[PDB]
Amino acid sequence: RKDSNKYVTAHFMVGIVENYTVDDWKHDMELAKETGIDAFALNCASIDSYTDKQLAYAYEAAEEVDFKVFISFDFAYWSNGDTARITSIMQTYADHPGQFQYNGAALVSTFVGDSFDWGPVKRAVDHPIFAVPNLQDPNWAGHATTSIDGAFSWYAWPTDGGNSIIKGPMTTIWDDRFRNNLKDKVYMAPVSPWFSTHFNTKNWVFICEDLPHLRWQQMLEMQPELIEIISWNDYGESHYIGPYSEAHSDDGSAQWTKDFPHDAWRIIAKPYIAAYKAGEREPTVESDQLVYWYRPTPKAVTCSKDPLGPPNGINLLEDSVFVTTLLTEPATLTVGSGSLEFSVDVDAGIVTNSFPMGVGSQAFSVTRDGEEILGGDGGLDVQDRCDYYNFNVYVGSFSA
């Protein structure tokens, strides 16, 4: 294999892991390694008393299991008055053997913090630093005064700049604005599968649908310098692709996430990550597999007791069951959704098809030359009633 200079990272919420041990970190890291992810962005806050402890555990774990990590300073909490502490943290970790390196320099990033100047940090740390903050305006990325080396976009979902929820499908419009402004500097593109949040302070969806697959196809077209997956473990916004960890701290998101595994989305990601790193325009399918996802009820069901209203944007969703097939040769896909039954011929490669949702049991089957290659029952029966509004999805898979 030829050496590559493209890398995939994943956003990790340090704020929810006060009780993590080194072993807990290692478990997440092994699953990320198996997906082909190169590093976790350790998103952390100045206000958490356990930040230094958990950064130390994560860097130790990464060095022990041949993984890499870098810091995402979360400027919802860190502030422009924190140069001294940010500098001291980078002095500790920029040359750590577990620190992710890009072109010989320690990668550092942010959530927000567009106005934070990296100059004083870089000039105080002997080891080179490569600063790729999260920037909100593509125009600023092209004119920033903060000594940046690239920009990371958080525009992972369909949006038009405003505060209305817009329909999909997702496009590359924002990616292409960042790339135009960045010129020779690097772009770290966001990849997210889904979005649903349901708190007193934030209650909306974005219109994602086929996004768990479609976004990876956009990455092969676009070939950004870096990718960050949003997210490994942000349960509260439903975009996690990592496991539901036993050791994280619940914020109320257990209501819509505890029984909703998302691990099978890593089956889609794995071959696309390999193709992205190799510069290939299509993935290589190693074996026959299927990944499916769907919401728990039809979108129009009224709840019996939710103290929060329905999320903003749900009228734009479809009542669909989504199926990504990963096929070595062409085959036939059959889906039963309640009383509904559908069939479609599917090409070799990785293809997503959506099917009308019916209340009841869900069934999946792929047949080739008249014989069933893979199949089984969906792990969740769709219902026609709910106690609370849950616009997260259940995800599952079958593998030959």
Numbering used by the authors: 32 to 431
Task: Paste lines from the article.
Glycoside hydrolase family 71 (GH71) includes α-1,3-glucan degrading enzymes which could be exploited for biotechnological applications; however, the family is presently poorly understood. To increase our understanding of GH71, we have performed a phylogenetic analysis of the family and detailed biochemical analysis of two of the five GH71 enzymes encoded by Aspergillus nidulans (AnGH71B and -C). We present the first structure of a GH71 protein, AnGH71C, including structures with carbohydrate ligands. These structures revealed a conserved acidic dyad (DxxE), found to be crucial for activity, and active site water coordination consistent with a classical inverting GH mechanism.
As no protein structural information is hitherto present for GH71 and to establish a greater fundamental understanding of the family, we pursued the structural determination of AnGH71C by macromolecular crystallography. The structure was solved to 1.33 Å resolution by molecular replacement using a model of the protein generated by AlphaFold232,33 and all residues of the protein could be modelled into the electron density map, except for 9 and 12 N-terminal residues in chains A and B, respectively, and the N-terminal His6 purification tag. Crystals of the apo protein and glucose-soaked crystals were of the C121 space group with similar unit cell dimensions and contained 2 molecules in the asymmetric unit, while the nigerotetraose soak was determined in P1 containing 4 molecules in the asymmetric unit. The protein contains an N-terminal (β/α)8 barrel, a short linker (9 residues), and a C-terminal β-sandwich comprised of 8 strands which packs along the side of the barrel. The β-sandwich domain has an immunoglobulin-like fold with a topology most closely related to Fibronectin type III (FnIII) members but contains an additional C-terminal β-strand (βE) compared to canonical members. The βE strand interacts with βA forming a four stranded sheet packing into a 4 × 4 sandwich which, to the best of our knowledge, is the first observation of such a topology. The interface in AnGH71C buries 21% of the sandwiches’ solvent accessible surface, as determined by analysis with PISA40, which includes several hydrophobic and aromatic residues along both faces and is stabilized by 14 hydrogen bonds and a salt bridge. The N-terminal (β/α)8-barrel domain is most closely related to GH99 (Cα RMSD between 2.8 and 3.1 to GH99 members), a family mainly containing retaining endo-α-1,2-mannanases as characterized members. The most distinct difference between the GH99 and GH71 (β/α)8-barrels is that AnGH71C lacks a region of ~50 residues found between β1 and α1 in the GH99 members, which forms a large loop wrapping one side of the substrate binding cleft.
